[PDB]
């Protein structure tokens, strides 16, 4: 029972994603180059990657049906708190179970100033999400639902946010019933929501370690202005 509106929403989110996610990595050439030899020698490259990814996430967010109805303040609140989660989510598309320059591993992320306190559960997240083998329709709906979360700190019009998210969540639940055949569909929605819960935890830890990194001006120096504005300064 996929309504015409729901199909519209899926069409919109797929296109919005195709316009903000380039799997060819063409733009990665414009980043400060990665350095593998190395104390924080990957920070410049990954910082640029995150800054870029935030720009792309913002472009995706604005194309979310209903999102434009929120106040700029509430749009800001949602993007500031979700940015890191949506980047972790969208990264899964490139995350491989098996250019080698732009193929990142544990030691790469470590050379950006992060520890296994984050990295381990991040890989666990990426492996578990990958196993769900989502349809791209489900992939883009999950990212949108993540962005439009009523419970983000600093949200004023929580009822509006919730109503937008509900439209999206109802669209996800219905899509899975009608389009995703079993066994692959078993509890799929509940598992997709669990991932959002996993992302809160990853968000939490990244914020802590980012605070340790960005405390030394020498490291803060290696970040970008957008990353400083969104993640904090």
């Amino acid at each position: 029972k996929l309504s015409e509106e729901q199909q519209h929403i899926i069409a919109i989110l797929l296109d919005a994603h195709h316009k903000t996610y380039d799997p060819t990595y063409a733009d990665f050439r414009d980043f400060r180059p990665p350095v593998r030899m190395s104390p924080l020698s990957m920070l410049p490259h990954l910082a640029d990657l995150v800054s870029y990814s935030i720009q792309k996430v913002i472009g995706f967010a604005k194309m979310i049906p209903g999102f434009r109805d929120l106040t700029s303040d509430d749009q800001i609140v949602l993007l500031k708190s979700s940015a890191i989660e949506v980047i972790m989510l969208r990264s899964n598309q490139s995350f491989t179970m098996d250019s080698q320059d732009y193929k990142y591993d544990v030691t790469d992320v470590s050379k950006a100033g992060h520890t296994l306190e984050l990295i381990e559960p991040l890989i666990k997240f990426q492996v578990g999400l990958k196993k769900l083998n989502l349809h791209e329709e489900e992939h883009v709906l999950l990212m949108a639902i993540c962005i439009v979360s009523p419970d983000r700190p600093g949200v004023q019009d929580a009822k509006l946010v919730e109503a937008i998210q509900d439209r999206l969540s109802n669209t996800l639940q219905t899509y899975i019933r009608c389009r995703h055949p079993p066994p692959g569909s078993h509890q799929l929605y509940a598992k997709m929501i669990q991932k959002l819960a996993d992302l809160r935890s990853l968000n939490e830890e990244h914020s802590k370690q980012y605070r340790s990194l960005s405390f030394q001006p020498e490291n803060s120096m290696k970040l970008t202005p957008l990353v400083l504005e969104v993640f904090g300064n």
């Binding site: 913002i58 700029s72 800001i76």
Partner: peptide
């Protein structure tokens, strides 16, 4: 505090 860049990107 204020988010000039984030604001500008959200049009």
């Amino acid at each position: 505090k204020n988010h000039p860049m984030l604001m500008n990107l959200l049009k």
